[PDB]
């Protein structure tokens, strides 16, 4: 009965060279029960993508919301929100749930439309906003993934070089956590394309 | 943990997973949850490692004191109830066990004991223990029958394997096979699940909630 | 973390360590401790991480209001004010700790708020988990009028300690200066003493290395 | 109530390859938020081309290496001076350890050294004597960060053949003495970044046919 | 803390250490006790810092707006005001305040207002973690209508053991004098209290 | 399984060039109390060890005969007793170090930190701790309970590794030490103003200061400072 | 409550649920329907904490009645299911949560495909080949891993049921006094009678 | 274990025992004997905590044949219930009490009277027409106390014991897998292999 | 309870009150808390009655035994056998004993034994739940080699304000003086010391 734990799931995400790549595995549970291993933790609002851990039924209930909030943010600025602004959006939502939190570790992923600046971001359960020049990792494999990312990472990687580390980083910490993996996905962010990879990963 | 050992036709399959955990973290994936107590015996472990690894392996020297004293193998009911009796004398005290010892004698002929740390000791046909044992029944039970030949009786151990260590979070890692004879047991292997899922999934049509 | 507050002559400075944890992990290697309530008034937090932060925008979101409301620039004893009994009403369950610092038209200030809502006065102060290592070496340093360059020594030194002997502090050191009559200098990464040195090996994989099932392009335009 | 047990931290590895093994371990000792010691060995030569750490508690695991290399010095006198081998060894801390099973020694424990086909060779202990010879061992307080880099650095995990449609495997291949302390060394230094536990200086106890031999490398003292 | 206020000739006179703890540690070595909620209506403080700062900061303000409506208040109605707040929230506070004040037709009282939020008026008071071991000294050496230097000397010497036996007491020894003449603050540092 | 009764605080040490310091305050305190004054918290073994005890009294005390009847038994049928057969403070240390670890295995410690400083017949300087956990570990500067987290921050400034060990004379190491006990006279509520202090010499030997007090304080700030916040007055 | 199955195929969602109510050491009732019919081509079946369970199943029958009656229009399966989730999500945080595990089959007419939704009473819904609710699923998913197939008609569907309950009947501890099965398709709902 | 039950008639006595070992939300064997024989015209059931139960019949087992061949002779069923009270007086107040519930059914020749005695983990003997251990007799006792005539035939006893077992797996929650079925008459011991 | 023991020129005294309390109830209001182990050593008892005169009665046997070997034992001998019960015995004793004796070498001693069992040499000693509200009070007014009078009134002026504010204290102060002349036991009666 610890919220965070029950469904199990991770999500990593990392800056490139002009590019930006976030990643999560597939797996539903109940505790040790898989269930499914079709849920995919990121999802996007624009350009801006949302990658959420934790409890599953709090992953859903944000991303329902904040595709309510932003889709209200377009049509009242005229134009999409950006990462940096989205972050704040999240980190707000969060924190006024201070003393009854989703049970969640949410990533922001994306590239700024104006600047063309890699931005990443991660949020404990109540809001406070970790920013990251490099990497930043979520879920019940978060100290295998910080391993991983920590010795695998170095700056300025190619889109096509950058897939594979974060790929790596993901694949090697989700074996070695019992909750995570049943497989993946890996999104890579370019300024004005985005490419889609399912993983082949071991499925027990 | 899933292990499995059922009596069939052509002797006795016993099947087992390699994973070890410690909560959510994955201690290993490379365990031999398979003690091969002399040429004629095996023991399954489940539950606590040590305490299946130290008391097993403690088993194995007891029958081997058993055959120079008596000058004859130990019977599967008799090396059984040495570690059934042995767990008795701890019960209460925290021991975790899981075990089934598997055999051939002469006397008995293929024989399966289930034994457990709160000292059941249960003679019988088909046993699956540990945290996959569910899934492992579930493949097992709805394919088994007594007349299968030896090639399919060593697939349907491995596959209810499979089953759990792809279902529990708690399971995986490789399976180890084992068949028992009149003869001994002979080894079949260790089957990663990486390759082996895939490998199962493609040949036979199953595993259809996996994106393939 | 470890964070401390030094007066001198003619203002104000203070510090803080960039260590984020989560139990024994460290979340953020490089993360900002020192916030800005008014232009001339900061606030060094410890504690709760979000509570700090959240705490510190809404005071200084309702100063900045009341700044325009007075035709005034804002007092240190308003952002004190209305700190601590905010923390007062919540009995403690925000877990903000704060060191409040700054000039106003009244001169220079420095104090410290505690979660439960009690607020102290000092020349030197210091809260946080290695403030026990902070204080040590401000006990031992510090001296009646000290020069805005000795007490940025000061502070960056009781910073170091904790930075070294606490490890629920690291990385690196921030420093905020107020002098009075002058502009507030935040001085982000101040010192930087924890540089990871060069990795004995490249792990860039070749090219093909990941298995990959499926690939497909993902429609971000409308 | 009294409390028997306490946490010492540190992080230790053990690496095996073909005509030599490493057994490494950071020097830092904690208690709680306080380093006790930067440079408290916690890997030890206990004779017969044995190494061998017990990582947790350091009360615990001094006690435990202090039995095992006295059951070394008693093997001598009790079977005519005969080298204590590596699989011997295993066995024989698994009753020191599980002796204690309800009352354990909490520590994760590993030993290397060569077998007896000359082979490098790692054993790794759970704090009640369950035992296994691997290739590849973390152990610790950042045994969780450092292992899953192990089993894609030393066995190629999850690594397969550019270009074959993630059909064929990367193939296991022994490492260089030269290619694992430089894997040693990377973990440490990442491990070090991210626990608060690791850090100050890193031993290594490199075993080959010709003795141990020593390394010392310093480490991030925050 | 150890804190008194003690009743004389001309007036009133109010004394506390100025040790904060956490635990073992003190937080603060030079902490002001004694505060100011009127002109000659001052209070020490003991018990939770935040109880008693939230407390003192209310009264100042329900005397503030007595003043500007009605003019000075008494110094009974200032410890009235603490009493209804102690009182009424007895459960959500740890507050022992002693309430000390100078008027010109009734001259210096000293109300102390414990945990439970009664109110005693006495001709002088003690209260804090380290009024405990001086108890005994105090009522064998206070007398009425004291002097000046005298009650300065029998707050010192008292304070002084206070200070010497509670491990939660020390630092320096502040005084608030509150007579006719005005208000005046007195400090004393350990080199001279000590050797008493 | 115990509570301590009457306790002693800090005991702060470290290793300069030719041997090692060591400092404990003379006080007993019975939780908040301050109870007893006279207590001496460093004992001396033979003319090279000095072992410096915090935690329970009774406990200390208990130490203390254990030690003393440690030099009795070390005596007999001993002719080089005052010579090469003399206890060493790594002998007292593993001792006390033994003890401490049987006494926490049976669920009944001496609650007690302890560090015993000395010099070896070498000439090495020895510095080493343990505690009712059996805890051991040694570091060129070394100290129990506040000291661990006051002192060490202060006496790591002097000496910060090994090396730095040869380049810090007695007096300069004796100046760190007196300046971390009014550190800690200042910050921790179980301190008193009273210390003692021992140096072991591997030239000088022995030399143990009685009835030292902590001096040079800083109040004269405290004068300027009013109420907690807006109080002018 | 306790054993609810669902299994989707090629052209309809299958649903099984236990008959057997129990409640002490007495089973007081052993042909229990533990299904309400939401609209003509969607289903829910539910288990959990006894009187939540139907009155949860109830309220949102009547939700989605209520929604039919106003718009002359019957609400997409995927459209239900959302419904009930967020019903479920709001509960999770009241005072007292409905304790309540659901699965909706439906068979959505303007897609012309059968649809299966997993959900518990923390509002998790998955869309799914085949799902369980409880102990069930430790038995039951290796089993359906293994047999099921995407394209199998009503009929092996229906086998494919029957090995479940076997399995079940086989090594659950508990008599559920077998189930009630009832299929979802193009033509709406049935009851098969001889299970 | 759980299902223990017994019953006296004219000519012999009845023991019934369900089959069912399940362990957690597995039942790892449908074909288990909860009795053994202390002697050729004495049969002991049993029924408790796991491990216990084997444990302690197998102990009163050898300890009344090891009387048998020493004194050549059987000891009277009443005799034999005396003598396991004893042991289980002894066990309640031990470090770690046998958690055992034992019905023993036997044939005393001396008398030509068949026997039961029900006793309990505690040590309560009593001797009946008809005994239960654990839930079993919440449903059975009334039923028995309605239909039990003390004058009937073995063959009576056994529709009236196939009365018990229908109604037990009609209300019970738990599914025990059947009974074994043994008679204990003036010829000694033998199983109904058709239940 | 509230006692205590003063050395002073021609030896020492040993002072107590005379309450034994059962929670709020006083059982005995004449209670004799100064008792005898030898000749010239005696002790005052706080705490757990039973436990504390169960220790008594053994250090009693044992000095009894000491002197038909050994002949008479000092003080310092008295006290360790009080702290080797107290200490040994720790986890299963509620026992705070001052030991107080005369030798003709020695002169007067006190050694005070609290909880833990550790054992204190001092001038002076003062223990019990009374004691706590006379620490300020005895450490300003004791002063080495008083006569007897003034040890007299020294240890009823305190005991007197001990029993004043702890509830657990009162009766009679009684007195046993231990000098080279002999033993001589005091009494003094609330009419007396209620009213110094
Ligand atoms: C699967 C993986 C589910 O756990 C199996 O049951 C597996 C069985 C097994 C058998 C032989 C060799 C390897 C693995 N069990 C484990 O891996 C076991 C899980 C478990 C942990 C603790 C338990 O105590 C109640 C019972 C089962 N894992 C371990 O034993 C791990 C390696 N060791 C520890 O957790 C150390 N603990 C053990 C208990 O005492 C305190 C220290
Ligand atoms: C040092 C690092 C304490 O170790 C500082 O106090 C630091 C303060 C800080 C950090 C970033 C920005 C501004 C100020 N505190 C932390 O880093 C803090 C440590 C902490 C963890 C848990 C606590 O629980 C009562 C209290 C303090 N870490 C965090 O706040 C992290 C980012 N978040 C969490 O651990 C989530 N918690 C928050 C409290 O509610 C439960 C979940
Ligand atoms: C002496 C030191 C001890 O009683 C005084 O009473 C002193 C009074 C004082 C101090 C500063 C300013 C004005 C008056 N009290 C304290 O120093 C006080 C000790 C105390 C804490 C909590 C209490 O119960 C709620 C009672 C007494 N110290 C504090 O309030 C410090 C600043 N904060 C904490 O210790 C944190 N507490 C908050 C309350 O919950 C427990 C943790
Ligand atoms: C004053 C009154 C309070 O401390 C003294 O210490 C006094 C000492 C004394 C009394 C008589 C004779 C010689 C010395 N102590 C008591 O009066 C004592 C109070 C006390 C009881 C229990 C304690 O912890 C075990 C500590 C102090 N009173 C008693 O022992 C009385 C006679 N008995 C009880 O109260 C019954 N107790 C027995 C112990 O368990 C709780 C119930
Ligand atoms: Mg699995
Ligand atoms: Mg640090
Ligand atoms: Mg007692
Ligand atoms: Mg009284």
Redesign the interface.
């Known amino acids: 009965s610890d919220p965070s734990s029950i469904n199990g799931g991770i999500v990593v995400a990392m800056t490139g060279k002009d590019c930006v790549a976030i990643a999560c595995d597939l797996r539903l549970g109940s505790q040790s029960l898989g269930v499914s291993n079709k849920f995919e933790k990121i999802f996007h609002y624009g350009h801006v993508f949302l990658g959420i851990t934790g409890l599953a039924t709090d992953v859903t209930t944000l991303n329902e919301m904040f595709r309510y909030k932003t889709n209200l943010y377009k049509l009242k600025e005229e134009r999409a929100i950006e990462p940096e602004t989205f972050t704040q959006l999240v980190s707000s939502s969060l924190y006024e749930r201070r003393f009854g939190p989703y049970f969640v570790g949410p990533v922001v992923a994306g590239i700024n439309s104006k600047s063309g600046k890699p931005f990443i971001a991660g949020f404990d359960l109540i809001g406070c906003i970790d920013e990251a020049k490099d990497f930043i990792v979520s879920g019940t494999a978060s100290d295998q993934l910080f391993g991983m990312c920590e010795s695998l990472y170095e700056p300025n990687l190619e889109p096509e070089d950058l897939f594979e580390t974060i790929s790596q980083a993901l694949l090697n910490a989700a074996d070695r956590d019992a909750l995570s993996g049943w497989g993946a996905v890996v999104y890579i962010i370019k300024k004005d394309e985005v490419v889609k990879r399912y993983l082949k990963m071991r499925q027990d | 943990t899933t292990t499995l050992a059922f009596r069939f036709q052509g002797g006795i399959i016993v099947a087992v997973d390699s994973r070890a955990t410690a909560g959510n973290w994955v201690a290993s994936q490379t365990v031999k949850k398979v003690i091969e107590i002399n040429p004629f015996l095996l023991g399954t472990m489940a539950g606590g490692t040590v305490d299946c690894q130290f008391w097993e392996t403690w088993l194995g020297s007891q029958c081997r004191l058993h055959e120079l004293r008596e000058k004859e193998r130990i019977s599967v009911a008799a090396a059984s109830k040495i570690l059934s009796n042995l767990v008795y004398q701890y019960k209460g005290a925290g021991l975790s066990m899981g075990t089934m010892i598997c055999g051939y004698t002469r006397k008995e002929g293929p024989t399966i004991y289930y034994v457990d740390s709160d000292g059941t000791r249960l003679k019988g046909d088909i046993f699956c223990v540990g945290s996959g044992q569910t899934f492992a029944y579930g493949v097992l039970d709805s394919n088994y029958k007594w007349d299968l030949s030896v090639e399919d009786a060593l697939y349907l151990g491995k596959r209810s394997i499979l089953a759990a260590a792809h279902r529990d979070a708690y399971s995986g890692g490789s399976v180890n096979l084992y068949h028992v004879t009149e003869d001994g047991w002979i080894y079949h292997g260790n089957h990663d699940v990486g390759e082996l899922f895939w490998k199962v999934k493609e040949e036979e049509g199953s595993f259809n909630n996996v994106i393939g | 973390t470890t964070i401390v507050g030094v007066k001198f002559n003619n203002g104000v400075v203070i510090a803080a360590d960039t260590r984020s944890t989560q139990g024994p992990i460290v979340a953020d290697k490089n993360c900002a401790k020192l916030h800005r309530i008014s232009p001339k008034i900061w606030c060094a937090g410890a504690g709760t991480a979000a509570d700090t932060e959240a705490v510190t925008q809404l005071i200084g979101s309702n100063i900045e209001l009341h700044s325009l409301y007075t035709s005034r620039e804002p007092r240190v004893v308003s952002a004190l004010q209305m700190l601590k009994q905010h923390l007062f009403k919540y009995q403690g369950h925000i877990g903000a700790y704060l060191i409040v610092a700054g000039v106003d038209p009244t001169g220079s200030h420095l104090f410290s708020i505690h979660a439960h809502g009690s607020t102290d006065v000092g020349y030197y102060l210091s809260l946080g988990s290695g403030s026990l290592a902070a204080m040590a070496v401000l006990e031992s340093h510090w001296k009646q009028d000290l020069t805005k360059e000795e007490a940025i020594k000061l502070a960056s030194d009781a910073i170091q300690a904790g930075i070294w002997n606490d490890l629920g502090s690291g990385s690196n050191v921030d420093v905020c200066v107020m002098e009075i009559g002058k502009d507030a200098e935040y001085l982000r990464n101040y010192l930087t003493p924890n540089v990871r040195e060069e990795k004995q090996k490249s792990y860039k994989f070749p090219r093909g290395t990941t298995a990959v099932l499926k690939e497909s392009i993902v429609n971000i335009c409308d | 109530?009294?409390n028997?047990?306490?946490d010492?931290?540190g992080t230790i590895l053990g690496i095996a390859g073909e005509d030599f093994a490493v057994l490494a371990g950071d020097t830092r000792?904690?208690?709680?938020?306080?380093?006790?010691?930067?440079?408290?060995p916690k890997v030890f030569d206990c004779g017969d081309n044995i190494v061998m750490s017990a990582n947790g508690?350091?009360?615990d695991g001094?006690?435990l290496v202090k039995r095992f290399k006295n059951s070394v010095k008693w093997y001598h006198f009790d079977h005519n001076d005969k080298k204590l081998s590596i699989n011997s060894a295993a066995r024989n801390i698994?009753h020191l350890?599980?002796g204690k099973?309800?009352?354990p020694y909490y520590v994760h424990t590993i030993i290397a050294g060569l077998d007896e086909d000359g082979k490098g060779a790692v054993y790794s202990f759970?704090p009640?004597?369950?035992?296994?010879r691997?290739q590849c061992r973390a152990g610790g307080?950042?045994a969780?960060?450092?292992?899953?880099?192990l089993?894609?650095?030393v066995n190629f995990?999850?690594?397969?053949e550019?270009?074959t449609?993630?059909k064929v495997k990367?193939p296991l291949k022994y490492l260089s003495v030269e290619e694992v302390?430089?894997?040693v060394?990377?973990?440490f230094?990442?491990?070090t970044?991210?626990?608060?536990?690791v850090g100050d200086g890193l031993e290594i106890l490199i075993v080959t046919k010709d003795g141990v031999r020593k390394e010392f490398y310093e480490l991030?003292?925050? | 803390t150890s804190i008194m206020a003690v009743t004389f000739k001309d007036g009133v006179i109010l004394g506390a250490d100025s040790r904060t703890t956490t635990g073992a540690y003190i937080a603060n070595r030079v902490t002001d006790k004694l505060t100011r909620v009127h002109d000659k209506i001052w209070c020490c403080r003991s018990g939770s810092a935040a109880d008693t700062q939230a407390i003192a900061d209310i009264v100042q303000y329900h005397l503030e707006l007595y003043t500007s409506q009605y003019g000075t208040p008494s110094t009974e109605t200032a410890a009235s005001v603490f009493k209804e707040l102690c009182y009424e929230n007895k459960d959500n506070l740890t507050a022992g305040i002693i309430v000390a004040g100078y008027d010109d037709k009734n001259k210096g009282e000293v109300y102390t207002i414990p945990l439970g939020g009664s109110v005693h008026k006495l001709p002088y008071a003690i209260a804090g973690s380290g009024s405990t071991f001086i108890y005994g000294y105090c009522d064998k050496n206070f007398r009425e209508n004291m002097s000046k230097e005298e009650t300065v000397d029998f707050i010192k010497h008292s304070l002084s053991q206070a200070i010497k036996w509670d491990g939660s007491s020390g630092g320096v020894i502040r005084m608030v004098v509150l007579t006719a003449a005005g208000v005046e603050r007195l400090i004393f540092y350990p080199d001279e209290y000590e050797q008493l | 399984t115990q509570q301590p009764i009457v306790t002693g605080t800090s005991v702060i040490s470290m290793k300069y060039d030719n041997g090692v310091i060591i400092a404990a305050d003379n006080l007993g305190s019975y939780g908040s109390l301050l109870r007893f004054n006279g207590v001496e918290r460093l004992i001396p073994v033979g003319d090279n060890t000095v072992v410096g005890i915090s935690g329970d009294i009774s406990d200390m005390q208990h130490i203390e005969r254990l030690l003393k009847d440690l030099v009795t038994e070390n005596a007999y049928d001993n002719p080089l007793a005052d010579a090469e057969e003399a206890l060493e403070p790594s002998y007292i240390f593993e001792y006390l170090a033994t003890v401490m670890y049987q006494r926490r295995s049976k669920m009944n410690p001496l609650w007690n930190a302890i560090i015993v400083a000395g010099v070896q017949s070498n000439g090495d300087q020895f510095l080493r701790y343990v505690n009712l956990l059996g805890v051991t570990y040694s570091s060129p500067t070394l100290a129990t309970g506040f000291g661990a987290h006051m002192a060490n921050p202060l006496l790591r400034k002097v000496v910060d590794r090994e090396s730095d060990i040869p380049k810090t004379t007695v007096q300069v190491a004796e100046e760190a030490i007196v300046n971390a006990m009014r550190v800690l006279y200042y910050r921790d509520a179980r301190s008193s103003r009273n210390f003692s202090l021992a140096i072991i010499d591997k030239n000088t030997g022995l030399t143990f200061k009685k009835n030292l007090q902590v001096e040079n304080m800083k109040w004269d700030f405290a004068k300027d400072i009013k109420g907690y916040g807006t109080q002018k007055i | 409550m306790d054993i609810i199955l669902g299994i989707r195929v090629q052209d309809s969602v299958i649903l099984a649920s236990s008959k057997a109510v129990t409640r002490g050491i007495s089973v007081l009732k052993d042909s229990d329907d533990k299904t309400r019919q939401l609209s003509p081509h969607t289903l829910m079946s539910f288990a959990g904490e006894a009187g939540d369970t139907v009155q949860f199943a109830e309220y949102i029958q009547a939700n989605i009645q209520l929604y039919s009656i106003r718009e002359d229009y019957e609400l997409s399966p995927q459209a239900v299911s959302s419904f009930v989730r967020q019903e479920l999500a709001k509960s999770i945080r009241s005072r007292r949560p409905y304790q309540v595990n659901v699965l909706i089959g439906g068979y959505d007419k303007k897609k012309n495909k059968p649809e299966l939704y997993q959900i518990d009473y923390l509002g998790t819904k998955v869309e799914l080949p085949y799902g369980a609710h409880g102990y069930s699923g430790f038995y039951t998913f290796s089993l359906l891993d293994h047999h099921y197939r995407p394209d199998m008609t009503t009929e092996e569907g229906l086998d494919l049921l029957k090995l479940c309950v076997q399995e079940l009947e086989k090594r659950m501890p508990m008599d559920f006094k077998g189930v009630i099965v009832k299929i979802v398709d193009k033509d709406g709902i049935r009851q098969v009678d001889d299970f």
């Open positions: 109530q009294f028997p047990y306490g010492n931290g000792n904690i208690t709680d938020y306080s380093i006790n010691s930067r440079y408290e508690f350091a009360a001094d006690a698994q350890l599980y099973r309800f009352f759970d009640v004597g369950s035992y296994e691997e307080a950042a969780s960060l450092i292992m899953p880099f089993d894609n650095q995990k999850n690594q397969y550019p270009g449609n993630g990367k302390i430089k894997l060394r990377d973990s230094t990442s491990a970044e991210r626990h608060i536990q991030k003292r925050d």
